[PDB]
């Protein structure tokens, strides 16, 4: 079954882009990446920066999840990032997305050996 360290790399992680290039970008990989195939997932974040520098943040600021947990880290420096949000016109299975440029920190939740990112929790 899908382990939580590949579950993280499917969800957030788009390496091969450096920004969403048109308004589509949500809506297309929500799509491929499977985030739609229950249920519209209403936000998700990806991060176009290599998986070895997102995988490092686990080493980086620790600090409090927005939960309480105490197994979230801070990004150093600000990465690029793309925000997905749903629209008003979104409706299952046609879920439709806002395409939201930024660069920001971000703050993820780690866990295992090797210690690797499981959960995106924000970017500040």
Do not use: W
Not at 27 to 45: E, I
Not at 80 to 87: F, K, L, Q, V
Not at 97 to 117: F, L, M, R, S
């Amino acid at each position: 079954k899908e382990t939580a360290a590949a579950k993280f790399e499917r969800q957030h992680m788009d390496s091969s882009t450096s920004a969403a290039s048109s308004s589509n970008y949500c809506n297309q990989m929500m799509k491929s990446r499977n985030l739609t195939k229950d249920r519209c997932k209403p936000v998700n974040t990806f991060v176009h920066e290599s998986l070895a520098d997102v995988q490092a943040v686990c080493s980086q600021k620790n600090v409090a999840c927005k939960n309480g947990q105490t197994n979230c880290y801070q990004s150093y420096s600000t990465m690029s990032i793309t925000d997905c949000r749903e629209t008003g016109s979104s409706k299952y299975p046609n879920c439709a997305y806002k395409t939201t440029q930024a660069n920001k920190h971000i703050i993820v939740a780690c866990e295992g050996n090797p210690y690797v990112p499981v959960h995106f929790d924000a970017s500040v």
